[PDB]
Amino acid sequence: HWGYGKHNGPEHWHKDFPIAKGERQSPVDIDTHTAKYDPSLKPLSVSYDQATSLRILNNGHAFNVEFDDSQDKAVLKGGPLDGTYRLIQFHFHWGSLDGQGSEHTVDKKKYAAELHLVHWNTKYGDFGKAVQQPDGLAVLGIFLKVGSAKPGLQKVVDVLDSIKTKGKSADFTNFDPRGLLPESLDYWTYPGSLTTPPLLECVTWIVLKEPISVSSEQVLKFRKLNFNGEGEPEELMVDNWRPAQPLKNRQIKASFK
Numbered sequence: 001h002w003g004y005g006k007h008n009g010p011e012h013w014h015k016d017f018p019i020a021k022g023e024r025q026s027p028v029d030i031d032t033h034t035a036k037y038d039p040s041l042k043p044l045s046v047s048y049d050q051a052t053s054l055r056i057l058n059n060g061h062a063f064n065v066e067f068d069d070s071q072d073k074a075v076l077k078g079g080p081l082d083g084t085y086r087l088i089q090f091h092f093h094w095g096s097l098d099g100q101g102s103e104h105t106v107d108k109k110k111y112a113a114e115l116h117l118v119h120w121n122t123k124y125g126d127f128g129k130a131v132q133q134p135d136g137l138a139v140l141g142i143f144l145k146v147g148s149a150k151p152g153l154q155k156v157v158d159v160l161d162s163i164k165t166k167g168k169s170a171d172f173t174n175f176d177p178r179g180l181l182p183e184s185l186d187y188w189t190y191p192g193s194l195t196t197p198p199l200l201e202c203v204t205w206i207v208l209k210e211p212i213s214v215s216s217e218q219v220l221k222f223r224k225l226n227f228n229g230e231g232e233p234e235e236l237m238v239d240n241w242r243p244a245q246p247l248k249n250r251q252i253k254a255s256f257k
C-alpha cells in the first residue's frame with residue numbers, strides 16, 4: 001500500500017494512481033513574484049463559530065480531526081469560491097526536522113509543517129460525491145514555523161499519545177479550529193488536487209501567506225506518532241509530505257499586493 005517510504009512513497013504513487021502525473025496536481029511551489037494580484041478576489045469568509053469536532057484518528061499517514069458536517073456549521077466561502085464549502089476534517093503534514101515538512105513551498109522555502117482544513121462544496125451533498133467534481137473541495141492550507149507555541153494547538157498535541165499507532169482513534173469534542181488560524185487571511189489560490197491518493201483533481205487551494213508559529217515541543221510530539229500499527233516495528237510518522245509537483249498550465253493568484 002502507498003506511504004512515504006523509499007519503496008512506496010510519492011515517486012511510486014503514479015502506478016496505482018496514474019493521475020499523479022496529471023495536469024493539476026498538488027502541492028506546488030508558490031513563486032511569489034509570478035503570482036498575480038487579482039483585485040476581483042473577495043476576502044475569504046471563515047465561519048467556524050459553530051464547528052463541532054467528533055473524533056481524532058491516526059490513519060497511518062496523518063492524524064485527522066474529523067467534524068460533524070451534517071449541518072451548515074463550519075463554512076468556508078468567499079475568496080475565489082462560488083457557493084459554500086463545509087468543514088469535514090483537518091490534518092497536518094510535517095518533517096523529521098524543522099527545515100522540512102510543508103507540502104506547498106514559498107519561493108522554494110519549506111516550512112516545518114502545513115495544516116490542511118478540508119471543506120466540501122455543499123452543492124454536491126457530501127464529501128464522497130464532492131471529490132468526484134472539479135470544484136468539489138476547498139482546502140485551506142496554513143504553514144507552521146517553529147517559534148512561540150500555538151496555544152490553540154495544545155489540545156491536539158495532548159491527545160496524540162492516545163492515538164500513537166495506525167488505526168487508533170479517540171473521541172475529540174469541542175475543539176475550536178479558530179485557534180489554529182493566523183491573524184491575516186491574505187492568500188494565494190490555484191486549482192489542484194488531493195495531495196494523498198487518490199490524488200483527485202477536485203480542490204480549490206487557498207494557501208494563507210502568514211504562517212502560524214508552533215513551539216519545538218509541539219512539533220516534537222507530532223514526531224512521536226507512528227506510521228505502523230500497534231505491535232509492529234516502530235516507524236515514526238515523520239516526513240509525511242508530498243513534494244512540489246509541476247505547475248503545468250496553471251496560474252496562482254494572490255488576494256493581496
Ligand SMILES: [Zn+2]
Binds near residue numbers: 092195
Ligand atoms: Zn493534507
